[PDB]
């Protein structure tokens, strides 16, 4: 077919990598200057990005090369958090790496070793770097929030941000090990409120009950169903079809009105006020079913059920007829509430626990969409650690250690891979680099020195590259799970060590 | 069109080997570097096997064509074998250019290999020509599936492939029958599951499961009934599908569906087959109607499995419902729907144990590479082993015997005037580059690398030791355990030799261009 | 690498190219345009401002721009041009900064540091007046309305802008009396003197024919509900072959709508704000021919936007079936009014309806719609103007010499800084005394005494005085009868100082694909 | 660094005023004048200024950017 050779796909798989390794760094480390994502491709705008995969997937891939780490780190991103940024730039610094090595013909036998070697030593580095700071609870709830102030940093949330250090911190820690949207159940919503969001009491949704029924309900029995009516519902007379000429088209809309009737006396068999369903309806059925004295509370949120029966101790089932198949639930109230300018009726009467259901309030969708993800990393590494309360300083601290205790590794134990042990412990000072321009302030008198300087033992002491400055990456909070950065760190190195493996690529 | 001969074609002869064989030599072994291969589906393919590079090449040329069918062969012969047959045979084009170069005839320089070819297999033959059974094998197997499953760097823990590979091959192809029998051998595996996961399941398991939970999760041992019957839309080869318009024609199509299936599952159970196993399956209807008879029993299997539950469990055939009869029914040593711990990999197995007709592989992986990757490794193992199996001969690979075989050969070339000592020397001179190229994928000299091994064939006189196949620092075909098929050790010369011969003979070549596939 | 420097630099090209032209800003400076368009056309514009919003400018740099023009009228209303005088402004000092090879990011707070102080000097140079205060509503008001098409009847309209907002607005001190609060109703006919100033509800939605109900006791609200009748939401099993079983169905159709529309009535209701849904029909045009037969106004599919104000306003909720005859959740209305004036237009006048102690309906009438927009537009910059008195109390100048007022200033702030930002914000912080000039700039011959001089009568004015930009002189600009409430100028920086740097961000180029 | 050095005594100046500091010319860890012992005549640095001011000024001598044909022929 169509081969490739080992001249071009490897610089392919040098270039395509390091072209996509290149924008989501410079948004990276302390004060990262953001990318602007470009939108001419598909509609013509702006998008201002320090996210990797809004950088990366909303580019769609097309080099060979350019797939697997977009693709690795992109499940690095929703598996250990922020994926896509570090794995991407970390294998293409790493491919970068191996040009020289390349230009001399480091062996792609030896390359792959010599990083893979490296890879433990840093691995091990960053661990001999980590230590736990969740040695007491309240030590490992901050160490779960210092670890999460690493995950939820430098994003463009406010208020959030700082809702979901407690909030993940608070759900991770009453988890005992892990982190959950069950535990607690997000909501993005419009709203006044910009950043604001708080931990919601039972759950709410949006919409507004017109018409004859009453906008709130008291003491009301949750009869739960994931069965509704799509205005009609299919079943033996429903099927009816009388159209053949322009009369039976004007005939037919009407016989939906039909049909919308008989669908209430379903629920009424049941005998219940309350009767939630996942399903919706117009107005003009929202005029059937409150004459009927059956309430229809429509498109019943699937975790607002699952945020009420794991604290009201009700079930969650599959397809609903008659209430015995899917367990009842309790709210104390059935309300509609004002909320802002948005009109929403809610559920409450349970409060927190087990379950929890967060409401974000935001301007736009723009700072939601960043609080559930930000959360999404920050739980999963809090869930990390749980495992690991190591919590090794991040920065360019676990960075320049690594790379370090690298070297003097990447020196005797290699005769020779020493070309690839050393080309990776490189790479962990990159990031450093990328940053040290985008705080303005220099990178060289910097690494080498901080990196010696905390290599010889200030661990504390790191890069603060919001002044650019060597700072304390204790006091500061900058430190993370041992585990989010060890596995940044696994994934990368094949990214960068996979592709030099491919020195042909076919196309069939 | 043109007649294309002289060196003309003979560079379309030497043209297309070089750069079919040298991503093969690059992906040559475990050292062999893994090739991302990328579609104009514009899908990746990691290819560090040459056959699969094969697999996704066809290069234009007939040779380039015949390459990705050479191998093939070997592929389905030994399984491993694949990449060498092949990246070898281009060096003889190397080889004999030169050789015709230097003036000799083609077909002088054509013969001479062929004609030192017998030393090639015949030095090998002397290496290992043991014979072993089963559990005897199984050490061995495992020890050459310590090299044919790292083949493809995945033979950790994977013993387990192995050993059964090595019950696998002896029941479908006997030791005494000495044919190459892989057809019994029913290859089954789904994505998700894991390396360390892998099964042989001596019976059949079919992808369906019980229509009903409620419906027992057993079948007893034996009384399946094979039928073709319906019990959900019956699929013929051509009958177009007409659907209900109306509320009246709605009703009666419900009852009859289960007047007939109630009757039918009443009949299968009546017949006294526990399981139902239906040519054509269950639809969701069949099965409340099977559980209002209360039969367990399978939905829709496809058309000739159900022969292969005839074959597979010695059970007598019935092909239709209406020749039900209690005398012909569908065996089963015990019937489950197993999770392997990946439900992700789940199969309702019809168990076999007296009677197997076919033999089950069952392979698990985390992604489609992953079971392909243990796919690829334990074949090709199973093939070698096999090949074991039947007679088990092996060598001191890695180059480590291609020196040996280099020996003999550019010796004995000098000891005969003909003019085929030349074509013997290249013959020789052309069996090195495997080491070589393989050095060059272990990160090494290659060049020393072949008279390391010389220097040793000088002080050995026989591959034992050899150089790093593995690049873990040992230099040993040994107790590295490079060890494989020295069946398949020859079928790569044969392969090679004859072919190129064959590539040879016809300098002779009408195509509108010089080399066209 | 080269292509993040030359990206930004050529959206620093674009931007700043385009935004220089873009300063004749006001005056009666530079001729005329017709325009032919990137893909062709021929299209007379004038007066930047609504070339502005007028404006397609299509790179990565451009796009910003129309934005950043469009803001500052939401932002403000005012302002318009200003906020890209001073873009470009800011896409110069970047320049010599990254020619100075200075870091874009720290560049980029920078224009924090630019905008932080420079709002505080620009509050400096505030004159603060009071936001509930009739006559600083009035003044303020005036001067953009004065400026205004029509500055006769601005003496109308700023009343009407100054009661919009002190009926709308919350008492005493309040940030309040938004353009939603507001809604500006046109209406036909009438004058501009009868542009009237109703604190209520007045939808500007046509109310069907006339002699309708102007009486009082409406009943307004959106109703989802429909009218059903034979071929209309009810049943038929009559397909027609023939003419009679055409005409059967019509005759039942149109009298049992006649009586639901009663039921209408019956409600209550001498207006009804019809479902943009149909089925068939919803209601019918019979039937809003029978409803207008019981005086219940009805505008069939109304558009989105009266629906909305009246439950914004009045809390309007859906509404039962008229089978179901209603729920009362038709919003509470006290007058169902049509006026009619200059015997042109049909305007729903909800009054009486609930109202938070917001939404003033501005009706804006006159002989044409030219003559209803002249002071539409006029009374607009009276709202906002007071509106921005309202959002933020001062009274600056107009017209960009207070810009440099700041930059005199934000020089030595930054001198003071005696950061590597005391270069970056200080290069900008002179830069942006370009505007008064690049005002003036598009017209003649003989060009340069005036431009330079500009920042230099100012400077030599230095930092209380300087010359009027309009009216010419040193005189200090922030009391001149040329002002601005400090509102509309601060956000042309805050609006500026990010999409601008926001460039500074780009790094390289992408196109999702 | 060329900016954040003009920068530091930037600082430095805005701190205090002709000071004995100054930047390093030696490039010592202290930036000094002082004790960078870096001093020129008062003489030297006003007469230093008098050059560039004046050829500066020179470049504008009168008028006349006409050649006969010869201005650097």
Partial sequence: ?508 | KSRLMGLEALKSHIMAAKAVANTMRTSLGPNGLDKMMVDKDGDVTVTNDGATILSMMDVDHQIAKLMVELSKSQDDEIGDGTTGVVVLAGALLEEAEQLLDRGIHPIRIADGYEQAARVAIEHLDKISDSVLVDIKDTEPLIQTAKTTLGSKVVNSCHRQMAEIAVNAVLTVADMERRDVDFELIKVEGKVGGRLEDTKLIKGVIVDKDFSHPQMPKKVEDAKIAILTCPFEPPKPKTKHKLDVTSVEDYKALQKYEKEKFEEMIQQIKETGANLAICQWGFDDEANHLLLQNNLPAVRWVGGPEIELIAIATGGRIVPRFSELTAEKLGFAGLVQEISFGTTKDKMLVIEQCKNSRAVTIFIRGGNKMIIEEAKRSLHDALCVIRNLIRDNRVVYGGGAAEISCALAVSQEADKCPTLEQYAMRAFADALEVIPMALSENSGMNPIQTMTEVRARQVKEMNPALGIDCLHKGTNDMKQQHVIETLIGKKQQISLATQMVRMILKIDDIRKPGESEE | RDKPAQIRFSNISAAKAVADAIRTSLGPKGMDKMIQDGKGDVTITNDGATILKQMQVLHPAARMLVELSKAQDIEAGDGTTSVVIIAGSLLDSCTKLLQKGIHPTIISESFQKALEKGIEILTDMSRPVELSDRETLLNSATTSLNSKVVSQYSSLLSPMSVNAVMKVIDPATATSVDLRDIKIVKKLGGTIDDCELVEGLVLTQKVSNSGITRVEKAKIGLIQFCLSAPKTDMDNQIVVSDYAQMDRVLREERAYILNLVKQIKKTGCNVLLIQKSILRDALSDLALHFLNKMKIMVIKDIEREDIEFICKTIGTKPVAHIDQFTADMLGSAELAEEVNLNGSGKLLKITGCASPGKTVTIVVRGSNKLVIEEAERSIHDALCVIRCLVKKRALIAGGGAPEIELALRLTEYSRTLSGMESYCVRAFADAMEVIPSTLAENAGLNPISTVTELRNRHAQGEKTAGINVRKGGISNILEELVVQPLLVSVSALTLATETVRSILKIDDVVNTR
């Fill in chain 1, 1 to 508: 077919a169509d081969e490739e050779r080992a001249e071009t796909a490897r610089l392919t798989s040098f270039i395509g990598a390091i072209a996509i390794g290149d924008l989501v760094k410079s948004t990276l480390g302390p004060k990262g200057m953001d990318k602007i994502l470009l939108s001419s491709g598909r509609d013509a705008s702006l998008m201002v990005t320090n996210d990797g995969a809004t950088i990366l997937k909303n580019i769609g891939v097309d080099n060979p090369a350019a797939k697997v780490l977009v693709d690795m780190s992109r499940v690095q991103d929703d598996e250990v958090g922020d994926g896509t940024t570090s794995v991407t730039v970390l294998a293409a610094e790493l491919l970068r790496e191996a040009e020289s090595l390349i230009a001399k013909k480091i062996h792609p036998q030896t390359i792959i070793a010599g990083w893979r070697e490296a890879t433990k030593a840093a691995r091990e580095a960053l661990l001999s770097s980590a230590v736990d700071h969740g040695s007491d609870e309240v030590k490992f709830r901050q160490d779960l929030m210092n670890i999460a102030g690493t995950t939820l940093s430098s994003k463009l949330l406010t208020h959030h941000k700082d809702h979901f250090t407690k909030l993940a911190v608070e759900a991770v820690l009453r988890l005992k090990g892990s982190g959950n949207l069950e535990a607690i159940h997000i909501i993005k919503k419009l709203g006044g409120s910009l950043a604001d969001s708080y931990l919601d009491e039972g759950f709410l949704l949006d919409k507004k009950i017109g018409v004859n029924q009453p906008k709130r309900i008291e003491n009301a029995k949750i009869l739960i169903a994931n069965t509704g009516m799509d205005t009609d519902k299919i079943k033996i007379f429903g099927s009816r079809v009388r159209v053949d000429s322009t009369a039976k088209v004007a005939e037919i809309e009407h016989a939906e009105k039909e049909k919308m009737k008989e669908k209430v006396e379903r629920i009424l068999k049941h005998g219940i006020n309350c009767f939630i369903n996942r399903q919706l309806i117009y107005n003009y059925p929202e005029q059937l079913f409150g004459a009927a004295g059956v309430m229809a509370i429509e498109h019943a949120d699937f975790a607002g059920v699952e945020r009420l029966a794991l604290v009201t101790g009700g079930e969650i089932a599959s397809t609903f007829d008659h209430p015995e198949l899917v367990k009842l639930g309790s709210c104390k109230l059935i309300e509609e509430v004002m909320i802002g300018e948005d009109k929403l009726i809610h559920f409450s009467g349970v409060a927190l626990g087990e379950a929890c259901t967060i409401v974000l309030r935001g301007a736009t969708q723009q700072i939601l969409d960043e609080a559930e993800r930000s959360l999404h990393d920050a739980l999963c590494v809090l869930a990390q650690t749980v495992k690991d309360s190591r919590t090794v300083y991040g920065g360019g601290c676990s960075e320049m250690l690594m790379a370090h205790a690298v070297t003097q590794l990447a020196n005797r134990t290699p005769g020779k891979e020493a070309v690839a042990m050393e080309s990776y412990a490189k790479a962990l000072r990159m990031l450093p680099t990328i940053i040290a321009d985008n705080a303005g302030y220099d990178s060289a008198d910097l690494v080498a020195q901080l990196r010696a300087a905390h290599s010889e033992g200030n661990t504390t002491a790191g890069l603060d590259m919001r002044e650019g400055t060597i700072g304390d990456m204790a006091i500061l909070g900058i430190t993370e799970s041992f585990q989010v950065k060890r596995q940044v760190l696994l994934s990368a190195a094949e990214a960068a060590e996979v592709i030099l493996r491919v020195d042909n690529i076919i196309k069939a």
